[PDB]
């Protein structure tokens, strides 16, 4: 049993299905809050994973994701939520106005911690920013301006199944499952 | 004495001056790092002071400042440094284009912690964002786009002496001074 410190039940559901293949592992939500510090996603996850473990003292995970725009030097990054609520997708589009490089990526870092210490697992998906909002009612925030890899549709124009194998989130939990399967 | 957990000696140079008359005149830099959590300036300064005191166990102060622009809902706020280094002043001007509400304000929060707990001291300077960069070499970061109170010049066009009564940092320390004058 591995706990997931978060207030979002959907995060545990997604994790359980990507990992349902492992009959010896079950992820369970634990309502333990923790400080999300200022720094890279990796630092936020390691700090968060240790804080919770120091409290729970049982195998646990934490996760932090972000949206990175190249021409914006990696901004918004770990402050993705904040920036979405203050200036949103319109702010990103205004910021990228006339920019030749519209490349961007999403990244997820899972922070795991047990008796033996913290381990980080990552997943990324590179792409580019559309010049305008395109959505079919399928995304959250930046999803309506992000076009993944070789696609011509943005995440918000794609169904859950169409994004199921390529997302940063999927890729991070697969890195995590590899660790679980290669366990000793 | 009272230690200042900062890597910038220019900050303790500024404090000791403001606290010049107080017979206790003695702020001393101490190189103890602390996590800067995502939150409001107060939350940052509060968690940080407690964190450094827990290590030092002697009266300590820490500080955090930010630039908040009204039309952008307070952005960049506590994430002012990251935003300045990623999108810069140009990025904020871009965001404000065709925006008439250019109100903004600088804020500083000092966190002091003893064996008795934390106490916060604040300072604020209201103003507006110029339509362009203007500088004579004074200040840093957003100073070149911030016109304080009823001035015509930006912070970057005024000397420190000309900004004597319009420094959010000094207003904060003046609040801390009153607290010290009552404790001795």
Short mmCIF file of C-alpha atoms in Angstrom, two decimals:
data_model
loop_
_atom_site.label_atom_id
_atom_site.label_comp_id
_atom_site.label_asym_id
_atom_site.label_seq_id
_atom_site.Cartn_x
_atom_site.Cartn_y
_atom_site.Cartn_z
CA UNK A 1 0.00 0.00 0.00
CA UNK A 2 1.33 3.41 -1.12
CA UNK A 3 -0.37 6.61 -0.08
CA UNK A 4 -0.82 9.70 -2.25
CA UNK A 5 -0.90 12.99 -0.35
CA UNK A 6 -3.35 15.19 -2.27
CA UNK A 7 -6.80 16.68 -2.04
CA UNK A 8 -7.76 15.47 -5.49
CA UNK A 9 -9.31 11.99 -5.54
CA UNK A 10 -8.97 11.83 -9.37
CA UNK A 11 -5.21 11.74 -8.99
CA UNK A 12 -5.44 8.42 -7.11
CA UNK A 13 -7.84 6.96 -9.70
CA UNK A 14 -5.51 7.77 -12.58
CA UNK A 15 -2.55 6.35 -10.67
CA UNK A 16 -4.39 3.12 -9.81
CA UNK A 17 -5.33 2.36 -13.36
CA UNK A 18 -1.87 3.03 -14.81
CA UNK A 19 -0.63 0.70 -12.11
CA UNK A 20 -3.48 -1.81 -11.90
CA UNK A 21 -1.19 -4.20 -13.73
CA UNK A 22 0.74 -4.54 -10.41
CA UNK A 23 -1.53 -6.74 -8.31
CA UNK A 24 0.76 -6.28 -5.29
CA UNK A 25 0.35 -2.47 -5.25
CA UNK A 26 -2.55 -0.20 -4.34
CA UNK A 27 -2.42 3.55 -4.10
CA UNK A 28 -4.56 5.20 -1.46
CA UNK A 29 -5.30 8.85 -0.87
CA UNK A 30 -4.08 10.37 2.36
CA UNK A 31 -5.39 13.77 3.35
CA UNK A 32 -2.05 15.15 4.54
CA UNK A 33 -1.19 18.69 3.47
CA UNK A 34 2.45 19.72 2.86
CA UNK A 35 4.45 22.80 1.92
CA UNK A 36 5.01 23.23 -1.83
CA UNK A 37 8.20 25.22 -1.94
CA UNK A 38 9.58 27.64 -4.47
CA UNK A 39 12.05 25.91 -6.79
CA UNK A 40 12.03 23.32 -9.57
CA UNK A 41 9.34 20.63 -9.75
CA UNK A 42 11.92 18.13 -8.48
CA UNK A 43 12.61 20.18 -5.30
CA UNK A 44 8.88 20.64 -4.64
CA UNK A 45 8.30 16.88 -4.94
CA UNK A 46 11.26 15.79 -2.86
CA UNK A 47 10.52 18.33 -0.13
CA UNK A 48 6.85 17.40 -0.22
CA UNK A 49 7.47 13.63 -0.21
CA UNK A 50 9.87 13.85 2.80
CA UNK A 51 7.53 16.16 4.80
CA UNK A 52 4.61 13.77 4.43
CA UNK A 53 6.70 10.68 5.12
CA UNK A 54 8.12 12.25 8.26
CA UNK A 55 4.47 12.52 9.37
CA UNK A 56 3.06 9.25 8.05
CA UNK A 57 6.12 6.98 8.26
CA UNK A 58 4.68 4.70 5.54
CA UNK A 59 5.45 4.51 1.77
CA UNK A 60 4.07 7.65 0.15
CA UNK A 61 4.01 9.73 -3.05
CA UNK A 62 3.41 13.34 -3.98
CA UNK A 63 3.33 14.91 -7.44
CA UNK A 64 3.96 18.28 -9.04
CA UNK A 65 3.47 19.32 -12.66
CA UNK A 66 3.98 22.43 -14.75
CA UNK A 67 3.78 24.09 -18.17
CA UNK A 68 7.06 25.43 -19.66
CA UNK A 69 7.24 27.88 -22.56
CA UNK A 70 10.63 28.15 -24.32
CA UNK A 71 10.41 31.72 -25.51
CA UNK A 72 9.39 32.59 -21.95
CA UNK A 73 12.53 30.98 -20.51
CA UNK A 74 10.62 28.12 -18.88
CA UNK A 75 7.89 30.38 -17.42
CA UNK A 76 5.29 29.66 -15.93
CA UNK A 77 6.86 26.39 -14.76
CA UNK A 78 6.26 25.43 -11.12
CA UNK A 79 4.11 28.55 -10.70
CA UNK A 80 1.76 27.23 -13.41
CA UNK A 81 -1.40 27.33 -11.24
CA UNK A 82 -0.77 30.82 -9.94
CA UNK A 83 -0.10 32.24 -13.43
CA UNK A 84 -3.15 30.54 -14.85
CA UNK A 85 -5.38 32.26 -12.27
CA UNK A 86 -3.72 35.68 -12.59
CA UNK A 87 -3.09 36.09 -16.29
CA UNK A 88 -4.39 32.78 -17.75
CA UNK A 89 -4.08 31.46 -21.33
CA UNK A 90 -4.71 34.98 -22.71
CA UNK A 91 -1.65 36.19 -20.83
CA UNK A 92 0.49 33.43 -22.36
CA UNK A 93 -0.77 34.24 -25.86
CA UNK A 94 -0.13 37.94 -25.33
CA UNK A 95 3.38 37.07 -24.02
CA UNK A 96 4.12 34.95 -27.11
CA UNK A 97 2.77 37.51 -29.57
CA UNK A 98 5.22 37.79 -32.47
CA UNK A 99 7.46 35.09 -31.02
CA UNK A 100 8.91 32.74 -33.65
CA UNK A 101 9.61 29.97 -31.16
CA UNK A 102 6.29 28.73 -29.79
CA UNK A 103 7.73 25.47 -28.38
CA UNK A 104 6.64 24.35 -24.92
CA UNK A 105 6.29 21.23 -22.80
CA UNK A 106 4.42 19.82 -19.79
CA UNK A 107 6.27 17.92 -17.07
CA UNK A 108 5.25 15.87 -14.06
CA UNK A 109 7.51 14.86 -11.20
CA UNK A 110 6.35 12.22 -8.75
CA UNK A 111 8.02 12.30 -5.34
CA UNK A 112 8.24 8.89 -3.60
CA UNK A 113 9.49 8.30 -0.05
CA UNK A 114 9.77 5.40 2.33
CA UNK A 115 12.12 4.10 4.99
CA UNK A 116 14.88 4.18 2.39
CA UNK A 117 14.56 7.77 1.20
CA UNK A 118 13.16 9.81 -1.67
CA UNK A 119 13.07 8.76 -5.33
CA UNK A 120 11.89 11.01 -8.20
CA UNK A 121 10.06 9.82 -11.32
CA UNK A 122 9.56 12.01 -14.34
CA UNK A 123 7.42 12.30 -17.41
CA UNK A 124 7.49 14.98 -20.12
CA UNK A 125 5.66 15.81 -23.35
CA UNK A 126 7.05 18.43 -25.68
CA UNK A 127 5.03 20.40 -28.15
CA UNK A 128 4.12 23.90 -29.14
CA UNK A 129 1.73 26.69 -28.37
CA UNK A 130 -1.20 27.36 -30.69
CA UNK A 131 -1.63 30.97 -31.77
CA UNK A 132 -5.14 30.87 -30.34
CA UNK A 133 -7.50 28.97 -28.05
CA UNK A 134 -8.74 25.72 -29.60
CA UNK A 135 -10.98 23.51 -27.49
CA UNK A 136 -13.74 20.91 -27.77
CA UNK A 137 -14.41 21.02 -24.03
CA UNK A 138 -11.70 18.51 -23.11
CA UNK A 139 -9.06 20.26 -21.04
CA UNK A 140 -7.98 22.18 -17.97
CA UNK A 141 -6.26 25.57 -18.23
CA UNK A 142 -3.32 25.59 -20.68
CA UNK A 143 -4.71 22.56 -22.51
CA UNK A 144 -6.50 24.83 -24.98
CA UNK A 145 -3.23 26.31 -26.26
CA UNK A 146 -0.92 23.27 -26.17
CA UNK A 147 -0.37 21.08 -29.22
CA UNK A 148 1.48 17.84 -28.35
CA UNK A 149 4.31 16.42 -30.42
CA UNK A 150 3.13 15.72 -34.02
CA UNK A 151 -0.51 16.51 -33.47
CA UNK A 152 -2.34 19.45 -35.05
CA UNK A 153 -5.00 19.54 -32.29
CA UNK A 154 -4.46 20.98 -28.79
CA UNK A 155 -4.94 18.86 -25.61
CA UNK A 156 -8.40 20.52 -25.20
CA UNK A 157 -9.43 19.16 -28.66
CA UNK A 158 -8.39 15.62 -27.66
CA UNK A 159 -10.28 13.00 -25.66
CA UNK A 160 -8.90 11.37 -22.54
CA UNK A 161 -8.03 8.24 -24.50
CA UNK A 162 -6.26 10.21 -27.24
CA UNK A 163 -3.97 11.72 -24.61
CA UNK A 164 -3.71 8.54 -22.49
CA UNK A 165 -0.32 7.29 -23.76
CA UNK A 166 1.49 10.58 -24.60
CA UNK A 167 0.93 12.72 -21.52
CA UNK A 168 3.56 13.86 -19.08
CA UNK A 169 1.39 12.37 -16.31
CA UNK A 170 1.19 8.95 -17.99
CA UNK A 171 4.91 8.93 -18.65
CA UNK A 172 5.79 9.79 -15.02
CA UNK A 173 3.68 7.01 -13.53
CA UNK A 174 5.20 4.56 -16.05
CA UNK A 175 8.69 5.55 -14.78
CA UNK A 176 7.26 4.94 -11.27
CA UNK A 177 5.77 1.55 -12.20
CA UNK A 178 9.13 0.51 -13.68
CA UNK A 179 10.66 1.22 -10.27
CA UNK A 180 7.88 -0.75 -8.54
CA UNK A 181 8.21 -3.72 -10.91
CA UNK A 182 11.99 -3.82 -10.59
CA UNK A 183 11.64 -3.65 -6.80
CA UNK A 184 13.72 -5.96 -4.62
CA UNK B 1 21.70 40.36 19.00
CA UNK B 2 19.23 39.96 16.14
CA UNK B 3 20.37 37.96 13.14
CA UNK B 4 19.30 38.52 9.53
CA UNK B 5 19.07 35.33 7.52
CA UNK B 6 20.05 36.74 4.12
CA UNK B 7 22.85 36.33 1.62
CA UNK B 8 22.66 40.04 0.79
CA UNK B 9 24.86 42.10 3.17
CA UNK B 10 23.39 45.23 1.62
CA UNK B 11 20.17 44.41 3.47
CA UNK B 12 21.75 44.42 6.91
CA UNK B 13 23.58 47.60 5.90
CA UNK B 14 20.19 49.16 5.23
CA UNK B 15 18.58 47.83 8.43
CA UNK B 16 21.29 48.83 10.91
CA UNK B 17 21.00 52.37 9.51
CA UNK B 18 17.22 52.54 9.97
CA UNK B 19 17.76 51.11 13.45
CA UNK B 20 20.61 53.57 14.08
CA UNK B 21 19.31 55.47 17.13
CA UNK B 22 18.01 52.41 18.93
CA UNK B 23 20.68 51.73 21.55
CA UNK B 24 20.21 48.10 20.45
CA UNK B 25 21.70 49.05 17.08
CA UNK B 26 22.81 45.59 16.06
CA UNK B 27 21.46 43.56 13.16
CA UNK B 28 23.92 40.89 12.06
CA UNK B 29 23.90 38.84 8.87
CA UNK B 30 23.77 35.08 9.26
CA UNK B 31 24.07 32.70 6.31
CA UNK B 32 21.26 30.28 7.08
CA UNK B 33 19.12 29.30 4.07
CA UNK B 34 15.44 28.47 4.40
CA UNK B 35 12.73 27.13 2.12
CA UNK B 36 10.61 29.91 0.59
CA UNK B 37 7.20 28.36 0.31
CA UNK B 38 4.62 29.21 -2.27
CA UNK B 39 2.13 31.51 -0.57
CA UNK B 40 1.70 35.15 0.36
CA UNK B 41 4.67 37.26 1.44
CA UNK B 42 3.49 36.88 5.06
CA UNK B 43 3.33 33.08 4.77
CA UNK B 44 6.78 33.06 3.25
CA UNK B 45 8.27 35.27 5.94
CA UNK B 46 6.44 33.40 8.73
CA UNK B 47 7.48 29.88 7.73
CA UNK B 48 11.01 31.12 7.03
CA UNK B 49 11.62 32.93 10.35
CA UNK B 50 10.38 29.89 12.25
CA UNK B 51 12.62 27.67 10.09
CA UNK B 52 15.79 29.71 10.75
CA UNK B 53 15.06 30.20 14.45
CA UNK B 54 14.67 26.41 14.83
CA UNK B 55 18.29 26.13 13.64
CA UNK B 56 19.84 29.21 15.27
CA UNK B 57 17.68 29.41 18.40
CA UNK B 58 18.43 33.14 18.67
CA UNK B 59 16.24 36.16 17.69
CA UNK B 60 16.10 36.21 13.88
CA UNK B 61 14.52 38.12 11.05
CA UNK B 62 13.98 37.18 7.40
CA UNK B 63 12.27 39.23 4.70
CA UNK B 64 10.35 38.88 1.46
CA UNK B 65 9.21 41.54 -1.04
CA UNK B 66 7.12 41.60 -4.19
CA UNK B 67 5.75 43.68 -7.07
CA UNK B 68 1.98 43.40 -7.48
CA UNK B 69 0.21 44.79 -10.47
CA UNK B 70 -3.51 45.37 -10.16
CA UNK B 71 -4.69 44.69 -13.72
CA UNK B 72 -2.84 41.36 -13.64
CA UNK B 73 -4.51 40.37 -10.38
CA UNK B 74 -1.45 40.86 -8.17
CA UNK B 75 0.95 39.00 -10.49
CA UNK B 76 3.93 38.55 -10.14
CA UNK B 77 3.59 38.95 -6.34
CA UNK B 78 5.74 36.59 -4.26
CA UNK B 79 7.06 35.12 -7.50
CA UNK B 80 8.48 38.53 -8.61
CA UNK B 81 12.13 37.37 -8.90
CA UNK B 82 11.33 34.30 -11.04
CA UNK B 83 9.07 36.42 -13.26
CA UNK B 84 11.65 39.17 -13.56
CA UNK B 85 14.28 36.69 -14.68
CA UNK B 86 11.97 34.81 -17.04
CA UNK B 87 9.82 37.44 -18.83
CA UNK B 88 11.33 40.64 -17.44
CA UNK B 89 9.99 44.19 -17.35
CA UNK B 90 9.25 43.84 -21.06
CA UNK B 91 7.00 40.91 -20.24
CA UNK B 92 4.99 42.97 -17.77
CA UNK B 93 4.68 45.87 -20.24
CA UNK B 94 3.48 43.43 -22.91
CA UNK B 95 0.84 42.19 -20.45
CA UNK B 96 -0.29 45.72 -19.70
CA UNK B 97 -0.50 46.90 -23.34
CA UNK B 98 -3.75 48.73 -24.00
CA UNK B 99 -4.46 48.52 -20.29
CA UNK B 100 -5.37 51.82 -18.67
CA UNK B 101 -5.53 50.56 -15.07
CA UNK B 102 -1.77 50.60 -14.43
CA UNK B 103 -1.94 50.71 -10.63
CA UNK B 104 0.68 48.66 -8.81
CA UNK B 105 2.40 48.48 -5.47
CA UNK B 106 5.55 47.16 -3.85
CA UNK B 107 5.29 45.29 -0.58
CA UNK B 108 7.85 44.00 1.96
CA UNK B 109 7.18 41.66 4.87
CA UNK B 110 9.72 41.11 7.64
CA UNK B 111 9.50 37.99 9.74
CA UNK B 112 10.95 38.02 13.25
CA UNK B 113 11.04 34.91 15.43
CA UNK B 114 12.04 34.31 19.02
CA UNK B 115 11.39 31.59 21.52
CA UNK B 116 7.99 33.31 21.72
CA UNK B 117 7.11 32.83 18.06
CA UNK B 118 6.76 34.95 14.95
CA UNK B 119 5.80 38.58 14.48
CA UNK B 120 5.42 40.18 11.03
CA UNK B 121 6.17 43.73 9.95
CA UNK B 122 5.04 45.22 6.67
CA UNK B 123 5.69 48.18 4.43
CA UNK B 124 3.94 49.15 1.21
CA UNK B 125 4.47 51.71 -1.53
CA UNK B 126 1.64 52.33 -4.02
CA UNK B 127 2.19 53.68 -7.54
CA UNK B 128 1.67 52.87 -11.23
CA UNK B 129 3.49 51.14 -14.09
CA UNK B 130 5.08 53.45 -16.65
CA UNK B 131 4.34 52.77 -20.31
CA UNK B 132 8.07 52.17 -20.88
CA UNK B 133 11.45 51.51 -19.23
CA UNK B 134 12.95 54.70 -17.70
CA UNK B 135 16.19 54.68 -15.76
CA UNK B 136 19.16 56.75 -14.49
CA UNK B 137 20.86 53.66 -13.11
CA UNK B 138 19.15 53.49 -9.72
CA UNK B 139 17.46 50.37 -8.35
CA UNK B 140 16.92 46.99 -9.96
CA UNK B 141 14.27 44.80 -11.56
CA UNK B 142 10.87 46.48 -11.79
CA UNK B 143 12.22 49.79 -10.42
CA UNK B 144 12.62 50.96 -14.01
CA UNK B 145 8.86 50.69 -14.67
CA UNK B 146 7.43 51.77 -11.29
CA UNK B 147 6.40 55.39 -10.66
CA UNK B 148 5.73 55.84 -6.95
CA UNK B 149 2.97 57.81 -5.30
CA UNK B 150 2.74 61.24 -6.91
CA UNK B 151 6.13 61.22 -8.63
CA UNK B 152 6.74 61.57 -12.37
CA UNK B 153 9.92 59.54 -12.22
CA UNK B 154 10.25 55.79 -11.82
CA UNK B 155 12.17 54.24 -8.89
CA UNK B 156 15.10 53.75 -11.31
CA UNK B 157 15.25 57.51 -11.99
CA UNK B 158 15.49 58.48 -8.31
CA UNK B 159 18.44 58.28 -5.89
CA UNK B 160 18.13 56.33 -2.64
CA UNK B 161 17.94 59.62 -0.79
CA UNK B 162 15.07 60.74 -3.03
CA UNK B 163 13.34 57.47 -2.12
CA UNK B 164 13.92 57.89 1.61
CA UNK B 165 10.23 58.21 2.46
CA UNK B 166 9.00 55.90 -0.33
CA UNK B 167 10.77 52.63 0.40
CA UNK B 168 8.50 49.67 1.23
CA UNK B 169 11.53 48.02 2.81
CA UNK B 170 12.18 50.91 5.21
CA UNK B 171 8.52 51.31 6.09
CA UNK B 172 8.66 47.61 7.08
CA UNK B 173 11.78 48.12 9.18
CA UNK B 174 10.21 51.23 10.74
CA UNK B 175 7.37 48.97 11.89
CA UNK B 176 9.97 46.56 13.30
CA UNK B 177 11.73 49.49 15.03
CA UNK B 178 8.60 50.44 16.98
CA UNK B 179 8.38 46.83 18.12
CA UNK B 180 11.97 46.93 19.36
CA UNK B 181 11.61 50.31 21.11
CA UNK B 182 8.78 48.72 23.13
CA UNK B 183 10.86 45.68 24.01
CA UNK B 184 13.76 47.66 25.51
#
